[PDB]
Design a protein around this ligand. Structure first.
Ligand SMILES: Nc1ncnc2c1ncn2[C@@H]1O[C@H](COP(=O)(O)OP(=O)(O)O)[C@@H](O)[C@H]1O
Ligand SMILES: Nc1ncnc2c1ncn2[C@@H]1O[C@H](COP(=O)(O)OP(=O)(O)O)[C@@H](O)[C@H]1O
Ligand SMILES: Nc1ncnc2c1ncn2[C@@H]1O[C@H](COP(=O)(O)OP(=O)(O)O)[C@@H](O)[C@H]1O
Lengths: 110, 712, 474
C-alpha cells in the first residue's frame, strides 16, 4: 500500500538532470509532452529509455505504474537516430538540451 | 547509516543492485540512478540501483561479480554513496582475462563486448572485472583504460577498444566460473539449513573462540548421486572464503596400511593450518564402511582414525567436517554418535521447478533458439537429478555442434568466436538428447508438491474447510496432527490429501498398498522409520498412508492366516507416530475402505484423532465432478451435465470420471476418422452412459454409515 | 579410550594397553578409566578381526592381573551395558556396574545451578522452568545452555565496553548479569542429545493429583507399602504378598497417575514401558531386552515397573482375528519368566495396564504375576467435579464458575478430557490477561467457551464394552 504518485528524473547528454512530478497512473505521452516543453527545441524527435532497459514509446498509452517507473525512476534521454546522423555529419555539437528559460534557474544536487 | 549488509542477488545482471525502497527514499535516489559502493581495502564499484519486494530493509542485494570487484563476501557491510556527477564515456579499453580465453579466437568485441554494452548504459570503472556469456563459453574482461576517470557510463557513441594480450588474474581474485550459490538450483531449503549451521562460525569465528561451546562438528549430506552434495560443500567454502579440502573413500582406501591413515590425519592437520576450513569426505560409506561387513585391518583402523580425528575438532578451531553418503544407514553408525556427524541433511531429488532452475543454470552459456522450452523439458525429465540435466544440456549442445561443424570445417587449435556466436541449440536437439538420456535416480521415490488443488475436487465442501482449519488453526492461533478418511472407494480420499498439500505448497509423500506390502513381505518394516524421517526432512509435507489395511487383506482380510488386524508395518507406523511432534510441520493422513478391520490404535489420542467420512457425491456434487473433469476439454453446449448427474445417482466420483473419459475418447476417434467433431457432444456422453456403472453398491454404503454412527 | 587404542597398528594397541596398567601399579593407588569400552572390546562374536579378538584377550588378562596390582581399580564407560564382550563382566574383572542414565527434572535443575555458580543471574531468570522444558537434555546440553546464555549477556553489554583482548576489569565483569531472554535464546539454539531414550525418575505425582478412585489409591498402598511396613503380620498369617496388579478399563481415567502417585509417596523410581517397546522386541528379534527392563528395575530399586499396553503382544499376533491359537509368544514368555524370578524383597512392584483386557494372555493373571484386577471406569459425578477442582488448584477461579454444572454435562468425558477443559479455560483466561496489558481469575465465559471445543474421548459403545467385561468378571 505505500505509493500513489511518482517523481521522474531524466539524464541528459549535456550533463544536466531534468526532474518533474507525475501521477502513478500518468501516461507516457504526458512525460514526453513535459520533456518537449523543457527542451530548447520542443519539435526535435527523441526517445526516453527506462531504468530496466525497456524503451518507452510516445505513441503507446501505458501508465507509469505499468512501465515500472513508480514511485520513482531515472530515464536516459537520447535524440532520434535520424537527427543525430545529420547533427554529427554537419559537425554540430549538441551542447544544449534544455531551453535557457529553465537553465537560468538550475540548482545544485545535495 | 547509509550502510547495508551484503546479500544475494535476484537479478543476475552485473551492472545493477537491488535495495529496499525505503532506503532509496532516505538516500533520495531514484530507480536507475548511479551510485558508488564502498567496500574493504579502500575499493569501490559503480552500479545502478533498483528495488524489489524481497530485499530486506537493511541489506543490499548484489551478485558475485559486484562482490568480487569490491573484494567483499556475503554478510559483510558496505556504504552506498550516490554519484550523480558520473558522465558518459568517450573511449574505454577492455581486455579479456587469460584464464577464460583459451582455445577460442576471433573478434571478441563483436561477439561479446559489443552486444553486452550496446544500448545497455552500464556504469564502468577502471579496473572493473565483468562476465559476458555466449558461445558456450564464459569469458570475463577487465577494464584497463577509461578516457573519463575513474568511472563513467557507456553510451552508444562510446568507443570500445580491445587490443593486446589477455590479462593474468591476480592471486586475490577468484574465477567467475568457480562454483558458488548461484550455481545451485533446487534444494534451496537444504542450502539455507547449511548456511545457518556453517556460515556463522566461518564469517564470525570470534563468537565461538570466546566460548567453550563448539558449533556442530560434522554435517552428513545424503541422497542419490548427482544431487549437489559436493556442489553445496564447495559453494559454501567458496562463498565464505574457508579453505576447501577434498577427501574421498577411494583415495584413502587405495593406499596401503599406514599411508592410508597418515594421509587422512595429514589432511586434518592441513585444515587447522589453513583454518577456517571445511573438510569434505565423499563416499563416506567407502572410507568408513560398516565393520561387520569386512575383516580387513585397513578398513577398521581407518574408521578408528576418523573417529579420533572428529573428536579432535574441539581443538582444531574453525574447522568443520562434512561428508556425503547415499543413505544415513549405509555407514558405520559410530560416526553418527553425539558430536562427530550427529547432523544430517536430506538433499533429495529436485522437482519440476528445481529441474527447470538447474537447466537454466547449465544453459547460461548456451545460445538457445526461440523454440526451446526448458519448462516443458523439466516437466518430462522425471527421475533426473542435476548430474543428468547437465548431461542433457551437454548432449543437446553436442548435437547442435555436429550439425554446424560438419559444414564449418574449421580445423585449428582454437575456434573462432563468430562461428560459435551463430551456433544455436534447438528443440529438436534437446528432444534428441532426451531420447538418449536415462535418469540415474529413477528407482528412488520422488517427493514434490502435488498439482491437485481444491478446484479439482467436486463436492465435500465441509471436508475442504475442515482440512484448511486443521492446518491453519495451529498457525493462526494439543492440536491434532493427523486424520483418517473412511468410506467408499473413488470418492477423493487421495485428492483431499493432495489438495491441502497443494494450497499449503507442502510436499506430498504417497505410500500405497504395494509399498506397505513390500515392507511386510520382505521383513523390512524398519524402513517405516526412514519414511517418517523423510517426512521430517520434507517438512512442510503431508504424509499419506493409503490402503492402511492392504497387509491385513493380503493376509486374508475376511478369512485370515497367522495374523489379524496388526502387522509388522502398522506397528512400526504406530511407534514412529509417537515420536513426531505437532511442531514438525507434518500432517499425517490415512485412508481405508474397511475401517472395521484396521488396528484401532491409529485413532487413539495423539495419532489420527480426526475422523472424517467421505460419502458418495450428491446431485450437485456429481455435477461439480463432471465440470471439473471436463475443465480441460472443449464441450458442446448441448451437453446437459445436470441430466447426467440426475441419472448417475449411485455413481462415485471415479465412475463419473470414466464417463467423461469415455465421451472424450469417442470425440477423438470421430475427429480422427473425419480427417482421414471438434468438441465433445451429447451423443458421446449418451453412449458412455450405456456402459458406465456404479462401482459402490447400496450394501457398502450401509456398512460405512453404520460404522460412522457407531463411532460418532 | 577405545577408538584411540584401535587407531594403532597391531602390537601397538596391545603394548599401549599394557603400559597403562603397569603405570597404574607404579603410581598406585590409581584408577584406570576406559572410555568407549564397546569400541576397545566389542563382542568377539560380533567381529571378524584377529586384532579385535586379541585386544579383548589382552584386556581380560590385564583385568585378572589386578589381584596382584595392589590398590588399582579399573572403571569403564559404555553407551549400552550389553554392547560389550560378556567375558569382561564375569566374577572378578568388572564385577560391578552402575546405571547412570539420564538426569531427571530435579537433576537437570541441579546441573543448571552447578554451571551457574559463578554467573550473575537477573531476577527474571528461572532455572526450574528451564529444567522442566529441557526434556531430553543431558549435562553436556545444560552446560552449553549456561555458557551460551552467558555469552549472549556478554556480547549485549561487555563487548560494547571492552577491547578484543584477554584482560577485563573485575568491575565490568561483575556488572554483567544474564537475563531470562538469554537463556531462552540458548534453549532455542540447543537440541537435546538424548530425546529418544527412556528416562526413569521418581515422579512428582502425588495422591492429591488424582480425582476420584479413592478406594484404588488406598488399595495400592495396601499392595505396595503394607508388605514392608507390617511384615510381621504377613509372616504371622502365612500370606504371600502379590507381586503386581493389572488395571483395565477406558483410557484417560488416571491409570498413569495411580502408578506414579504410589511411586511418589514411596520415593521410588517410576519405569514406564510402552507398547511400542514390546512390539520392537518381538519384531526386531531382540527379546533379550526384556531382561534389560527387569534388570533396570532391580538396579533402580526401589521402583515401580509399569508395563503399559499389555495387549500389544496379543495384537501383534492379530488381536481381534489372528490365527487359531492363543496369545502365547516369545516376548510374553520371557516377561513371565523374569517376573517369576523377581523377589519382592528387592523393593520392585510391577503394575500393568491394558485397554483390551479380553485379549491378554491369561498367564499374566496367575498367582505370582498380576493376579489382582482393578477396574478403572470413567469418573462418576462426584469424581468429575473433583478432577476439575484438582486441575484448577493452581489458578484463581471466578465465583461465577459452576463446576458441578460442567461435570453434569460432561457425563461421558474421561479425566483426561476434563483436564483439557480446565487447561483450555486457563489458556483463554491467559489470552485475555495478556491483551489487557497491551484477568486475575478464570471466568465462566472461559469455561463455557472451552466446552465448545472439548469432546469425550470414549464413545458410548466403548463404555458398554468395558462395563460388560467388568460385569462378566463378577
Ligand atoms: N542441485 C543442483 N543444482 C545445480 N547443479 C547441480 C545440482 N546437483 C547436481 N548438479 C550438477 O551436476 C554435477 C554434479 O557432479 P559432482 O560435482 O560430482 O557433484 P555430486 O556428484 O556430489 O552431485 C555438476 O555438474 C553440478 O553442477
Ligand atoms: N470428489 C471427487 N471429485 C472429482 N473427481 C473425483 C472425486 N472422487 C474421485 N474422483 C476421480 O476418481 C479418480 C481417483 O480418485 P482417488 O482419490 O485416487 O481415489 P482413491 O483415493 O479411492 O484412490 C480421480 O482421478 C478422480 O478423477
Ligand atoms: N482421574 C484423574 N484425575 C486427574 N487427572 C486425570 C485423571 N485421569 C486422567 N487425568 C489427566 O489425563 C492425562 C492422561 O492420563 P493417562 O493416565 O496418561 O491416560 P492414558 O490412558 O492415555 O495413559 C494425565 O496427564 C492427567 O493429567
Amino acid at each position: 500500500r505505500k505509493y500513489n504518485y511518482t517523481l521522474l528524473r531524466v539524464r541528459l547528454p549535456d550533463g544536466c538532470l531534468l526532474q518533474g512530478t507525475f501521477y502513478a497512473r500518468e501516461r507516457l505521452g504526458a512525460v514526453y509532452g513535459f520533456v518537449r516543453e523543457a527542451l530548447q527545441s520542443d519539435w526535435l524527435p527523441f526517445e526516453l529509455l527506462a531504468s530496466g532497459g525497456q524503451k518507452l514509446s510516445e505513441d503507446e498509452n501505458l501508465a507509469l505504474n505499468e512501465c515500472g517507473l513508480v514511485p520513482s525512476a531515472l530515464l536516459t534521454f537520447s535524440w532520434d537516430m535520424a537527427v543525430l546522423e545529420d547533427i554529427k555529419a554537419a559537425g554540430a555539437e549538441p551542447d544544449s538540451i534544455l531551453k535557457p528559460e529553465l537553465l537560468s534557474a538550475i540548482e545544485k544536487l545535495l | 547509516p547509509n550502510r547495508l549488509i551484503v546479500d544475494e542477488a535476484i537479478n543476475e545482471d552485473n551492472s545493477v543492485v537491488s535495495l529496499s525502497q525505503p532506503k532509496m527514499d532516505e538516500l533520495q535516489l531514484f530507480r536507475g540512478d548511479t551510485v558508488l559502493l564502498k567496500g574493504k581495502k579502500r575499493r569501490e564499484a559503480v552500479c545502478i540501483v533498483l528495488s524489489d519486494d524481497t530485499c530486506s530493509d537493511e541489506k543490499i542485494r548484489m551478485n558475485r561479480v559486484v562482490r568480487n570487484n569490491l573484494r567483499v563476501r556475503l554478510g559483510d557491510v558496505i556504504s552506498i554513496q550516490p554519484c550523480p556527477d558520473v558522465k558518459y564515456g568517450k573511449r574505454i579499453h577492455v581486455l579479456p582475462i587469460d584464464d577464460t580465453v583459451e582455445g577460442i579466437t576471433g573478434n571478441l568485441f563483436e561477439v561479446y563486448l559489443k552486444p553486452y554494452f550496446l544500448e545497455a548504459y552500464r556504469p564502468i570503472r577502471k579496473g572493473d572485472i565483468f562476465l559476458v556469456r555466449g558461445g558456450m563459453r564464459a569469458v570475463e574482461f577487465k577494464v584497463v583504460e577509461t578516457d573519463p576517470s575513474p568511472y563513467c557510463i557507456v553510451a552508444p557513441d562510446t568507443v570500445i577498444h580491445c587490443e593486446g594480450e589477455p590479462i593474468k588474474r591476480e592471486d586475490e581474485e577468484e574465477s567467475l566460473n568457480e562454483v558458488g550459490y548461484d550455481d545451485i538450483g533446487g534444494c534451496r531449503k537444504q542450502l539455507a539449513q547449511i548456511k545457518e549451521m556453517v556460515e556463522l562460525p566461518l564469517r564470525h569465528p570470534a563468537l565461538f573462540k570466546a566460548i567453550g561451546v563448539k558449533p556442530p562438528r560434522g554435517i552428513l549430506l545424503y541422497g542419490p548421486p548427482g544431487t549437489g552434495k559436493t556442489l553445496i560443500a564447495r559453494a559454501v567454502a567458496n562463498e565464505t572464503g574457508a579453505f576447501f579440502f577434498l577427501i574421498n573413500g577411494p583415495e584413502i582406501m587405495s593406499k596401503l596400511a599406514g599411508e592410508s591413515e597418515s594421509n587422512l590425519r595429514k589432511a586434518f592437520e592441513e585444515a587447522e593450518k589453513n583454518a577456517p576450513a571445511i573438510i569434505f569426505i565423499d563416499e563416506l560409506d567407502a572410507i568408513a564402511p560398516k565393520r561387520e561387513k569386512t575383516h580387513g585391518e585397513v578398513e577398521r583402523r581407518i574408521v578408528s582414525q576418523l573417529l579420533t580425528l572428529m573428536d579432535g575438532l574441539k581443538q582444531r578451531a574453525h574447522v568443520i567436517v562434512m561428508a556425503a553418503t547415499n543413505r544415513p544407514n549405509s555407514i558405520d553408525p559410530a560416526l553418527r554418535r553425539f558430536g562427530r556427524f550427529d547432523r544430517e541433511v536430506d538433499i533429495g531429488i529436485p522437482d519440476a521447478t528445481g529441474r527447470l532452475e538447474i537447466l537454466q543454470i547449465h544453459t547460461k552459456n548456451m545460445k538457445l533458439a526461440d523454440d526451446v522450452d526448458l519448462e516443458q523439458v523439466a516437466n518430462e525429465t522425471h527421475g533426473h537429478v542435476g548430474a543428468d540435466l547437465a548431461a542433457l544440456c551437454s548432449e543437446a549442445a553436442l548435437q547442435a555442434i555436429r550439425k554446424k561443424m560438419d559444414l564449418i570445417d574449421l580445423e585449428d587449435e582454437t575456434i573462432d568466436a563468430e562461428v560459435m556466436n551463430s551456433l544455436a541449440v534447438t528443440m529438436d536437439d534437446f528432444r534428441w538428447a532426451l531420447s538418449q538420456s536415462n535418469p540415474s535416480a529413477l528407482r528412488e521415490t520422488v517427493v514434490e508438491v502435488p498439482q491437485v488443488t481444491w478446484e479439482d475436487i467436486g463436492g465435500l465442501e465441509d471436508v475442504k474447510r475442515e482440512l484448511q482449519e486443521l492446518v491453519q488453526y495451529p498457525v493462526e492461533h494439543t492440536p491434532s496432527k493427523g486424520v483418517l478418511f473412511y468410506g467408499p472407494p473413488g470418492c477423493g480420499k487421495t485428492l483431499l490429501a493432495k489438495a491441502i498439500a497443494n494450497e499449503c505448497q507442502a510436499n506430498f509423500i504417497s505410500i500405497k498398498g504395494p509399498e506397505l506390502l513390500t515392507m511386510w513381505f520382505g521383513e523390512s518394516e524398519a524402513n517405516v522409520r526412514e519414511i517418517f524421517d523423510k517426512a521430517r526432512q520434507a517438512a512442510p509435507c503431508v504424509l499419506f498412508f493409503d490402503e492402511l489395511d492392504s497387509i491385513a487383506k493380503a493376509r486374508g482380510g475376511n478369512i485370515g492366516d497367522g495374523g489379524g488386524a496388526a502387522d509388522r508395518v502398522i506397528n512400526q507406523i504406530l511407534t514412529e507416530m509417537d515420536g513426531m511432534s505437532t511442531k514438525k510441520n507434518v500432517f499425517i493422513i490415512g485412508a481405508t475402505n474397511r475401517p472395521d478391520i484396521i488396528d484401532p490404535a491409529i485413532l487413539r489420542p495423539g495419532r489420527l484423532d480426526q475422523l472424517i467420512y467421505i460419502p458418495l457425491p450428491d446431485e450437485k456434487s456429481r455435477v461439480a465432478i463432471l465440470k471439473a473433469n471436463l475443465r480441460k476439454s472443449p464441450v458442446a453446449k448441448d451437453v446437459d451435465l445436470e441430466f447426467l448427474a440426475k441419472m448417475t445417482n449411485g455413481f462415485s466420483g471415479a465412475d463419473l470420471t470414466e464417463i467423461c473419459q469415455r465421451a472424450c475418447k469417442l470425440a477423438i476417434r470421430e475427429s480422427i476418422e473425419s480427417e482421414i467433431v471438434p468438441e465433445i457432444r451429447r451423443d458421446h456422453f449418451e453412449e458412455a452412459m450405456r456402459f458406465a456403472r456404479r462401482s459402490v453398491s447400496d450394501n457398502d454404503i450401509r456398512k460405512y454409515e453404520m460404522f460412522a454412527q457407531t463411532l460418532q | 579410550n577405545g577408538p584411540e587404542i584401535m587407531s594403532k597398528l597391531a602390537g601397538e594397541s596391545e603394548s599401549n594397553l599394557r603400559k597403562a596398567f603397569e603405570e597404574a601399579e607404579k603410581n598406585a593407588p590409581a584408577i584406570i578409566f576406559i572410555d568407549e569400552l564397546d569400541a576397545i572390546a566389542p563382542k568377539r562374536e560380533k567381529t571378524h578381526g584377529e586384532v579385535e579378538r586379541r585386544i579383548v584377550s589382552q584386556l581380560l588378562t590385564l583385568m585378572d592381573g589386578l589381584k596382584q596390582r595392589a590398590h588399582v581399580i579399573v572403571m569403564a564407560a559404555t553407551n549400552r551395558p550389553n554392547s560389550i564382550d560378556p567375558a569382561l563382566r564375569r566374577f572378578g574383572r568388572f564385577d560391578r556396574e552402575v546405571d547412570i542414565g539420564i538426569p531427571d527434572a530435579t537433576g537437570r535443575l541441579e546441573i543448571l545451578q552447578i554451571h551457574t555458580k559463578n554467573m550473575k543471574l537477573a531476577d527474571d531468570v528461572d532455572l526450574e522452568q528451564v529444567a522442566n522444558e529441557t526434556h531430553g537434555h543431558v549435562g553436556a546440553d545444560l552446560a552449553a545452555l549456561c555458557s551460551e546464555a552467558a555469552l549472549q549477556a556478554i556480547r549485549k553489554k561487555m563487548d560494547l565496553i571492552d577491547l578484543e583482548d584477554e584482560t577485563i576489569d573485575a568491575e565490568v565483569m561483575n556488572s554483567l548479569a544474564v537475563t531470562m531472554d538469554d537463556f531462552r535464546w540458548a534453549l532455542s539454539q540447543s537440541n537435546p542429545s538424548a530425546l529418544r531414550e527412556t528416562v526413569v525418575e521418581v515422579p512428582q505425582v502425588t495422591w492429591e493429583d488424582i480425582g476420584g478412585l479413592e478406594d484404588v489409591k488406598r488399595e495400592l498402598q495396601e499392595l505396595v507399602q503394607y508388605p514392608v511396613e507390617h511384615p510381621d503380620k504377613f509372616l504371622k498369617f502365612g500370606m504371600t504378598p502379590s507381586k503386581g496388579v493389572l488395571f483395565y478399563g477406558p483410557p484417560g481415567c488416571g491409570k498413569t497417575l495411580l502408578a506414579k502417585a504410589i511411586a511418589n509417596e514411596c520415593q521410588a523410581n517410576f519405569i514406564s514401558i510402552k507398547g511400542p517397546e514390546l512390539l520392537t522386541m518381538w519384531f526386531g528379534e531382540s527379546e533379550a531386552n526384556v531382561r534389560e527392563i527387569f534388570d533396570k528395575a532391580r538396579q533402580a530399586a526401589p521402583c515401580v515397573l509399569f508395563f503399559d499396553e499389555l495387549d500389544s503382544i496379543a495384537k501383534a499376533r492379530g488381536g481381534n482375528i489372528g490365527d487359531g491359537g492363543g496369545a502365547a509368544d516369545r516376548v510374553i514368555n520371557q516377561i513371565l519368566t523374569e517376573m517369576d524370578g523377581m523377589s519382592t524383597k528387592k523393593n520392585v512392584f510391577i503394575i500393568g495396564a491394558t485397554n483390551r483386557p479380553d485379549i491378554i494372555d491369561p498367564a499374566i493373571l496367575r498367582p505370582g504375576r498380576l493376579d489382582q484386577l482393578i477396574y478403572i471406569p470413567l469418573p462418576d459425578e462426584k469424581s468429575r467435579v473433583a478432577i476439575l477442582k484438582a486441575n484448577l488448584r493452581k489458578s484463581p477461579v471466578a465465583k461465577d464458575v459452576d463446576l458441578e454444572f460442567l461435570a453434569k454435562m460432561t457425563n461421558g468425558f474421561s479425566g483426561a478430557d476434563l483436564t483439557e477443559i480446565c487447561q483450555r479455560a486457563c489458556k483463554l483466561a491467559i489470552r485475555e490477561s495478556i491483551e489487557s496489558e497491551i484477568v486475575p481469575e478464570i471466568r465462566r465465559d472461559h469455561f463455557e467457551e472451552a466446552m465448545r471445543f472439548a469432546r469425550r474421548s470414549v464413545s458410548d459403545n466403548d463404555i458398554r464394552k468395558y462395563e460388560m467385561f467388568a460385569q462378566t468378571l463378577q
